[PDB]
Amino acid sequence: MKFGIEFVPSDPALKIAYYAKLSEQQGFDHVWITDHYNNRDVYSTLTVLALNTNSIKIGPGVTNSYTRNPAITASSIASIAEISGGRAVLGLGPGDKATFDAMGIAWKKPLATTKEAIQAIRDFISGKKVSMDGEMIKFAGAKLAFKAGNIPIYMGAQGPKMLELAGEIADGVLINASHPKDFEVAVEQIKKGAEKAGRDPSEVDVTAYACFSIDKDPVKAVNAAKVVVAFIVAGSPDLVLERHGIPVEAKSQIGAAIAKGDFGALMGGLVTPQMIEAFSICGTPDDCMKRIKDLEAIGVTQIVAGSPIGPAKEKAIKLIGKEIIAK
Amino acid sequence: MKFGIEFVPSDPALKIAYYAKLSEQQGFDHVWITDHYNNRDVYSTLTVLALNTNSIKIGPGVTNSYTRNPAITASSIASIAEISGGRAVLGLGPGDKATFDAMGIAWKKPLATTKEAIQAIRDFISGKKVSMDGEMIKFAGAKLAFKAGNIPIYMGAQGPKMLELAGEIADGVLINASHPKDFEVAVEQIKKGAEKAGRDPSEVDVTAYACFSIDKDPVKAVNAAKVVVAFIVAGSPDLVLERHGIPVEAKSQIGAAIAKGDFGALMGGLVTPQMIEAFSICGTPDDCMKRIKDLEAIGVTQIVAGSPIGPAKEKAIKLIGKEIIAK
Amino acid sequence: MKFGIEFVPSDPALKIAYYAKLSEQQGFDHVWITDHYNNRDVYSTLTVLALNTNSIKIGPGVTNSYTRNPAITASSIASIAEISGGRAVLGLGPGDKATFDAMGIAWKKPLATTKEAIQAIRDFISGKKVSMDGEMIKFAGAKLAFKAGNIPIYMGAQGPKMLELAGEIADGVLINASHPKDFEVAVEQIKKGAEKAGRDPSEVDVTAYACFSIDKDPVKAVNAAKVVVAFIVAGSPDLVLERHGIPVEAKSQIGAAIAKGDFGALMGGLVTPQMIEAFSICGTPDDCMKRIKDLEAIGVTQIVAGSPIGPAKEKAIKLIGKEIIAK
Amino acid sequence: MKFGIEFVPSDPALKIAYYAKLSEQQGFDHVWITDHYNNRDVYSTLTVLALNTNSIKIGPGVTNSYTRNPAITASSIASIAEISGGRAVLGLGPGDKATFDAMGIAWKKPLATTKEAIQAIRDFISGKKVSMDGEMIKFAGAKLAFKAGNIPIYMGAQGPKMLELAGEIADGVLINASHPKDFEVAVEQIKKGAEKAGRDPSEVDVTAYACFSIDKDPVKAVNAAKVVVAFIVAGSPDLVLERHGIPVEAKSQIGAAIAKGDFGALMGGLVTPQMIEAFSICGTPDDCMKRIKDLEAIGVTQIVAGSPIGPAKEKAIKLIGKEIIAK
Ligand SMILES: C[C@H](OP(=O)(O)OC[C@@H](O)[C@@H](O)[C@@H](O)Cn1c2nc(=O)[nH]c(=O)c-2cc2ccc(O)cc21)C(=O)N[C@@H](CCC(=O)N[C@@H](CCC(=O)O)C(=O)O)C(=O)O
Ligand SMILES: C[C@H](OP(=O)(O)OC[C@@H](O)[C@@H](O)[C@@H](O)Cn1c2nc(=O)[nH]c(=O)c-2cc2ccc(O)cc21)C(=O)N[C@@H](CCC(=O)N[C@@H](CCC(=O)O)C(=O)O)C(=O)O
Ligand SMILES: C[C@H](OP(=O)(O)OC[C@@H](O)[C@@H](O)[C@@H](O)Cn1c2nc(=O)[nH]c(=O)c-2cc2ccc(O)cc21)C(=O)N[C@@H](CCC(=O)N[C@@H](CCC(=O)O)C(=O)O)C(=O)O
Ligand SMILES: C[C@H](OP(=O)(O)OC[C@@H](O)[C@@H](O)[C@@H](O)Cn1c2nc(=O)[nH]c(=O)c-2cc2ccc(O)cc21)C(=O)N[C@@H](CCC(=O)N[C@@H](CCC(=O)O)C(=O)O)C(=O)O
Ligand SMILES: [Cl-]
Ligand SMILES: [Cl-]
Structure with missing residues (x-):
């Protein structure tokens, strides 16, 4: 059994970095960070976590395909992969209607959008030149200029x-x-x-x-x-x-x-x-x-x-490490 | 005369942090970071710069209103403002056609979009609940959940x-x-x-x-x-x-x-x-x-x-510090 | 009235960095870190504080002239001055007998030792080649190979x-x-x-x-x-x-x-x-x-x-900032 | 064959951190940092390297038993072990005569000093209460108050x-x-x-x-x-x-x-x-x-x-990684 933990950037990243570090010491495998425009940025937050941890895997849980163009998401998760030495994992979901209403975002075709976005992202991270003309997502020769290494993708x-x-x-x-x-x-x-x-x-x-x-x-x-x-x-x-x-x-x-x-x-x-x-x-x-x-x-x-x-x-976190993870 | 310097995230953020630190030591007032989906994320980069500097002002030069929803931009620059103790400044431009073509983005009404985006962002940063129904940008009760302090906005x-x-x-x-x-x-x-x-x-x-x-x-x-x-x-x-x-x-x-x-x-x-x-x-x-x-x-x-x-x-950077900034 | 705050490295540096950051936001002028062999190193701790703060002054409160050769102290405080952009201040005291007994250290002539140590340190930080033949401290042509900038010295x-x-x-x-x-x-x-x-x-x-x-x-x-x-x-x-x-x-x-x-x-x-x-x-x-x-x-x-x-x-810390520092 | 690399703190730690990160990416196992009072502190330097790396082992190459009481050495390397998640390794040597002359240090019995210092340090790191009455090193009930985990010791x-x-x-x-x-x-x-x-x-x-x-x-x-x-x-x-x-x-x-x-x-x-x-x-x-x-x-x-x-x-560093480590 793998163990993960979630933190919401409603606290400063520096304070979350300590909880994440503690988690790493207690044997957790993953820390996940929520993504909502109203709290701190999921990536500046992941950046300070990456700098203050060494082996635990980290990543958004979950970001989405609408508030940021998928190419930006690919570039961002890859940047965290570079800084952390390959400990980045991408959590992508369709996003929740409440947050999107406030952002004035039309939740159009979550299913197709999400699938196309993930296909595009996997190709970016893979180093390919991306060209797509899907029903929701399109790219014409886009390509990352640095190498990503491998990044698993989890769906919400x-x-x-x-x-x-x-x-x-x-x-x-x-x-x-x-x-x-x-x-x-x-x-x-x-x-x-x-x-x-x-x-x-x-x-x-x-x-x-x-x-x-x-x-x-x-x-x-x-x-x-x-x-x-x-x-x-x-x-x-x-x-x-x-x-x-x-x-x-x-x-x-x-x-x-x-x-x-x-x-x-x-x-x-x-x-x-x-x-x-x-x-x-x-x-x-x-x-x-x-x-x-x-x-x-x-x-x-x-x-x-x-x-x-x-x-x-x-x-x-300590209770979980001692009375649960240590099975 | 104020002095600023630009770095492109085509180099890893850690290497750029040293150039930025050196610039701070040499008397520069601003370091600006470019934003293009094909290089490293402008924000994870600004985060490592913020952690490795102390007084120099930092920020994107320039991000835009199309690759990220303006609420995400507000939240991100505010996050960097928090981490750096109020040294963040926002550079926003309309974006360049070449990059947008690759990203499959319709450069629609740069002028109106940019104006509306900046109005929305100023309001987010200011702590207001944002409601807009412009010709390009709309929000329905969106609002940041942490305080931004003051963030100057520069237009490209x-x-x-x-x-x-x-x-x-x-x-x-x-x-x-x-x-x-x-x-x-x-x-x-x-x-x-x-x-x-x-x-x-x-x-x-x-x-x-x-x-x-x-x-x-x-x-x-x-x-x-x-x-x-x-x-x-x-x-x-x-x-x-x-x-x-x-x-x-x-x-x-x-x-x-x-x-x-x-x-x-x-x-x-x-x-x-x-x-x-x-x-x-x-x-x-x-x-x-x-x-x-x-x-x-x-x-x-x-x-x-x-x-x-x-x-x-x-x-x-040293030449500029010694032979120019020291006027 | 200036305001400072003290933290003991009996907690991990990452946790202290948050308290220090908070203090910076609350208007404190100084954070001081205690130095005892049994807790975390005063300097690795000051290093993570410096990376996570931007304007607040930091320094040991207080280190001493016996557990480390004064040249090492000079180099260390100068290293933190560089990393923090000149926010380092040196707190030096004679040390307490209890800690010294455990360390097997002869508390010999605290007064002369402390005076000589501070004279040597001021000269190192000042860029001079140091030569001394005091009743407790001696140097023969020692000299720092990087610049320190200015570092105030406080005595305990x-x-x-x-x-x-x-x-x-x-x-x-x-x-x-x-x-x-x-x-x-x-x-x-x-x-x-x-x-x-x-x-x-x-x-x-x-x-x-x-x-x-x-x-x-x-x-x-x-x-x-x-x-x-x-x-x-x-x-x-x-x-x-x-x-x-x-x-x-x-x-x-x-x-x-x-x-x-x-x-x-x-x-x-x-x-x-x-x-x-x-x-x-x-x-x-x-x-x-x-x-x-x-x-x-x-x-x-x-x-x-x-x-x-x-x-x-x-x-x-928040109480002091709100109900006291804001005078 | 394991591979290591050495950096002298005659450069700012931030600049070294990039070389270290690069070495980590290129497959090196160890980065070693020299210790001389005239350059930057070996530990503040190791602290910024630890925060900017993730898997590579780090440590002083080599520190000594004379410029710092062994208990301070124990506490410092233990502190870096905590911050880096157990990637710290201790390099200890007797020190070189030239550096010690300048520091006004009597190079007395290098052999016995070094052996006793290492015995004391292993015991501190091991969590023991240390009591020694050697011909050079003594302690009376000294003990670390936080846990070190395991730290290998190399001799210069x-x-x-x-x-x-x-x-x-x-x-x-x-x-x-x-x-x-x-x-x-x-x-x-x-x-x-x-x-x-x-x-x-x-x-x-x-x-x-x-x-x-x-x-x-x-x-x-x-x-x-x-x-x-x-x-x-x-x-x-x-x-x-x-x-x-x-x-x-x-x-x-x-x-x-x-x-x-x-x-x-x-x-x-x-x-x-x-x-x-x-x-x-x-x-x-x-x-x-x-x-x-x-x-x-x-x-x-x-x-x-x-x-x-x-x-x-x-x-x-890249040549070695590509044309040598990749054997
Ligand atoms: C879109 C929705 O999917 P859902 O899986 O129920 O989504 C609900 C939540 O998972 C979703 O709002 C999340 O993004 C919420 N969420 C977060 N959302 C965030 O925005 N940020 C977070 O940090 C957050 C964390 C989180 C963690 C785990 C997790 O599973 C969810 C989390 C839905 O109703 N789908 C249905 C209907 C499918 C449907 O037909 N939808 C489209 C498909 C169009 C097409 O096929 O092209 C349609 O109407 O046409 C289904 O899956 O069967
Ligand atoms: C849109 C265009 O603007 P422009 O200012 O000339 O664009 C050139 C650049 O500033 C712009 O492409 C940048 O975003 C490029 N750029 C970078 N672009 C990026 O995307 N990221 C970078 O990191 C980058 C660095 C950079 C740094 C500083 C800076 O000055 C610009 C930089 C333009 O042609 N404007 C005209 C006309 C615009 C117009 O009339 N508006 C709309 C009508 C809108 C309406 O009313 O509905 C129209 O043209 O259809 C004008 O200024 O008069
Ligand atoms: C040396 C001692 O000074 P003292 O001021 O009483 O020392 C008490 C404390 O300041 C001393 O134990 C500290 O270093 C404790 N200390 C810490 N000490 C640490 O080791 N670590 C800490 O982080 C710590 C925190 C702290 C914070 C503030 C502060 O005021 C000091 C702190 C003393 O007893 N002085 C006397 C006698 C001096 C004298 O003449 N006797 C000596 C002088 C030496 C000579 O003859 O040249 C001798 O003759 O034997 C005096 O000032 O009158
Ligand atoms: C003391 C000396 O040891 P040595 O091993 O030759 O020392 C040379 C160097 O290794 C030593 O000066 C190092 O600290 C230099 N050094 C550095 N030293 C530093 O101070 N900083 C550095 O960062 C540094 C880089 C470095 C990296 C690797 C390495 O091997 C050495 C490095 C020596 O004379 N050893 C003799 C024996 C000396 C002797 O027996 N004399 C005493 C011994 C003490 C006793 O009596 O018990 C006596 O008998 O009285 C021997 O090895 O046979
Ligand atoms: Cl900083
Ligand atoms: Cl790290």
Whole structure:
């Protein structure tokens, strides 16, 4: 089992560099950095992380094909590959509608766009002169002027079609879920895509980009996760809420409280233990270990400790290293 | 007189950081970094520069509004402002047609786009929630989540209209020219724009983004600048070649030789001494000083030593520091 | 009033770099780093601080003349001056007997050694070829091979004689005290030394290297400072305890409790409010401001927030910046 | 065969960091940094190299037991081990008489001092509380307060006794020589020491710390080496000079010209081709490969490209990577 961790550039990069360094010392394999125009740049951030780490792999989790031309993304991830000595990996997703509305971006044909963008990027990184005339992406003789070395590409995917596409073209899949039921479905979609492309499905690093919260005190752990779990439930499609036996009505109820900023309600009972059990990996190290082994049995090969990671980051990272990674 | 220097990310960022540090030690005020998808990322590069410098101002010279959404540009330059302690400055231009053709980008309405992008960026950096519905740029409630501090914005401009627009909205103008005749025309355009906006024209940092080549041996200096002068002449609009008494036919002749890669012709006599005198600041420290003071008299407030800088960068940077900046 | 802050390399340098950066943003003038063989190297630590800061002054507080040959100290502080663009300042003291016993070092003639070491160091930094044949320090034609620029030298001093020597040769004095009574005596000593050397006593930056603990909640503040105050009282010479009306017997009682590790006694009443008032600057921002202005009236020109700084570092640094430095 | 490279801090650390990064990309295993009070600090330099590299091993080549108390050396190399993620290696030698004279340091019992210092350092790094009462080095309960991980220790040695001691206690030996004849003798000495200690002699990394100069043009190569070779000669014991048929007169001759600053002399005659063959590995890649394979057959396991490396460093580092390391 590979282990990764996620940091949001809502903190200065220098502070994140320390968490990433700590992760490297604790045995993590990957640190992933979110990309949203409203927080710090994903690349200046990756640059200070690369300078302050030595062996851990790093990369965006996930950037997209719309806020930056794919040639710029290729050049950027390659730059981080050079600075870090080949530890860069590219996480690309279609982007989320909310962020795009604010940016005045037309989310047009996510599927085709993403596939074309990844094809173009793989060719750039590969050193080829790129010429494309796709339904969304086009290049006429573009080419990088420095060498990239090898850069794995992971797709961010939730929907059945994106999952299938990931099995067809990605080296890994970052899935925003925490429960075995969700990965049971995801693994099948990835498998269909893998066969459709004729590649061995076990080639793809199926990873759980989970809401993670660990602590020796389980109630301290769940409390740190409630708000995040709330936002997850608020944005979960009916189909998913269904799968976990969670009243679809609870979504509106929670969306409401969030709209009103009534976090007192969220902590007060709105976030039920069922929501916590279905949308996060939390509790004591034992609780988290059990969930992790269930995911392993279903075919998950990398587990990423996503926000909040735990009540206090530094202590949680150490807990994970000592009580989990050291298996 | 302020002094700046330009570096192209066709060299690894670590090597550029040393040149930048040396420039800081030699008394330069600004280092500017070019932005082209085919070289290293302008931002990962600015990040390593920021970490290895302390007081010199830094920034892209120049990025654009098309290869990255303006919100991403705001976030990135603000990120560099945070890391460097407020030493970031933003250089924005409309971009060059050649690069955009390769990237499959429609250069649509450079003027309106650039104006709207700068208005949006100033608002982001300023901490406002941005809502726009311009003819090229739109945002719906977008807003940065961290504070930017103050970030001056410089426009890259060559054409009369861009120049006028810079006088109307920018804090400085990076003009790709080297001769007083060109700046005589540019200063008038900037002045028209400044009056059109009701601001004091002396607020804008009129800067000469020149082709610079300095050495104790003048012939070593001109030879280092010929190829660059060639590309400048090849892309100069008839109107400009005219102004310097350079046969407009020479442009085709040189464009030809460049197409065939016959640099032996370029060095052999195609680049005339007249072209060198009109499109570059080069020679010995005295020659360069004379030209610089001529530009100063015309109203130039910042001189940037652009490529090649000199036969060997390290020695040239020291020469400029010792024989020019120390006035 | 200048403001400084102290960090002990008992934390990794990367974590300290963030606190130092924060201090820079909060308006501090100096960050000082302690030097003891048992924690991280004072210089590798200053190196990562220099790379992650831009304007704040940095330096050891304080290193000494025994654990490293003075020529090495000269070279090291000059190396940090180069990397940081001239923000290095040298804090040198005679060293503490406890640390030296462990290192098997004979604390021989602190006074003469310190004076000779500082004379040699000033000459190295100044570019001179050094030749000395003092009663403790000797050099025969030694000389730095790179330029240092200017580096102020601060002496660490507690005793009347060291204080006098500081007034005679240092640019500043780091005094381990927090109460006006102690600085009343110190300022006289520094003045005697200043006159003995014929220099204007107001040239020296008289600074209070104080035990500092600030918080909106005063009791949270004093509790964070008790253990540190305990060790201060435990090591205070009878003369000093006397000056603050503190039973000299309390020193043994506290030393005992410390020996037995009975910190429950220290928190339980052993550390009296009188000890807290005489050996630390703590309480709410108002309490701290009052003490600071008392020190200012006595002639203190720099106040350093030494350990613990506050219940939690990050929050305390921000408190000091907002409720104190912004005067 | 392992490959290493040496840099002297007579250049700013930022510039060295690029050469080190390049070496990492070109396949070198080790970069070694010299330690002399007159150049930049060996540790601030190692700190910037560590931040700008990722996998290559780094360390002082070589520091000593006299200019810094061994506990400080332990703490410093441990600090670099932490920052670099365990890539630190310690090179310790007895120091050279010329540097010590200038520093006013009595070179007392190099052998016992070096052995005791290494024993103390291994114990510090190992986490032990150190107590020693040797004939040169003493400690009373000293102990590091942070964990070092593993740090190999290499000894710098030329003399037969130092070589024997290295075989007895070191993990590797950095020998200042370039010719098989010298390594034939050294390997025997190291073997005697290894048997005296009962360890397998093939445990020690016998390395040639050679004067190296490589270039497609053998003559520009040997000219780049003349100065370094001059200093190597003027410092060779007559036992050595005699070993290479070089007139023991040529040392006073060369030494004189050095004191005079007469480098024209060294370049135009005093440094003979006998001296170049005797004390350096230089010519074309083929010439260098032949010599390297000769050393390999004699038992050398690491070859370090020491100054000048080649006519121009950057090009030489690439030549070695391409035409030698890629074997
Ligand atoms: C587009 C969407 O795909 P999705 O996989 O559900 O996307 C939801 C989220 O994964 C997506 O918004 C992400 O980018 C969110 N996201 C982040 N997004 C960010 O922008 N930044 C982040 O840091 C972030 C982190 C992150 C980590 C992992 C992860 O999986 C997601 C993350 C969708 O609904 N797809 C459906 C429908 C497909 C469909 O038909 N879409 C197009 C296809 C058009 C064509 O085929 O050309 C259509 O309508 O025509 C499907 O996959 O079946
Ligand atoms: C668009 C063009 O502008 P220009 O200023 O002449 O363009 C030349 C360059 O400044 C521009 O191509 C640059 O971005 C090139 N450039 C680089 N370009 C890059 O992309 N990146 C770099 O790193 C680079 C370095 C550089 C440094 C400084 C600098 O001055 C320019 C640099 C132009 O022709 N403008 C005309 C007319 C423009 C016009 O009329 N507007 C639109 C109408 C828009 C509307 O109203 O709807 C039209 O032409 O259709 C004018 O200035 O009057
Ligand atoms: C030497 C000593 O000076 P002192 O000022 O009392 O020393 C106390 C401390 O300053 C000394 O232990 C420090 O180095 C502690 N110290 C640190 N020391 C460290 O080793 N590391 C640190 O990072 C640290 C932090 C610190 C910060 C500020 C500061 O004020 C000093 C700091 C002393 O006792 N001096 C007396 C007596 C001097 C005297 O005449 N006796 C000696 C003088 C030598 C001679 O005769 O020439 C002799 O005769 O034996 C006096 O000043 O009156
Ligand atoms: C002391 C001397 O040792 P040596 O090994 O010949 O020393 C020559 C060099 O290795 C030594 O001066 C180095 O520190 C030089 N040196 C550097 N030294 C530096 O100071 N800085 C550097 O960065 C540097 C570069 C370098 C890299 C590799 C390398 O091998 C050496 C380097 C010597 O005389 N050794 C004799 C024995 C001497 C002896 O026995 N005398 C004493 C021994 C102590 C005792 O009695 O126990 C005596 O018996 O009294 C021997 O090896 O047989
Ligand atoms: Cl910096
Ligand atoms: Cl690194």
